[PDB]
Design a binder for this molecule. Structure first.
Ligand SMILES: [Mg+2]
Ligand SMILES: [Mg+2]
Ligand SMILES: [Mg+2]
Length: 80
């Protein structure tokens, strides 16, 4: 239903900017645990929920691609 689309693009964007493209799954899991704290406060709890719900698919995809619009489309967070 796209309810996490905007927060997905913001948190994957944080990672896209701040993680190397070469990153290990362990490196991405650690970044996912910290990423929501870097978003504006109104997104904080939504981002925590998003990351907990999508963590498995996020780790699988982010080792291959970190573009926010693509990642969020591919995992279903942004249905377009
Ligand atoms: Mg739901
Ligand atoms: Mg802040
Ligand atoms: Mg705070």
């Amino acid at each position: 239903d796209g309810g996490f689309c905007e927060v997905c693009k913001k948190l994957v964007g944080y990672l896209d900017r701040n993680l190397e493209k070469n990153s290990t799954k362990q490196e991405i899991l650690a970044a996912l645990e910290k990423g929501c704290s870097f978003l504006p406060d109104p997104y904080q709890k939504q981002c925590d929920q998003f990351v907990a719900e999508y963590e498995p698919v996020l780790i699988e995809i982010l080792v291959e691609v970190m573009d926010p619009s693509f990642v969020c489309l591919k995992i279903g967070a942004c249905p377009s």
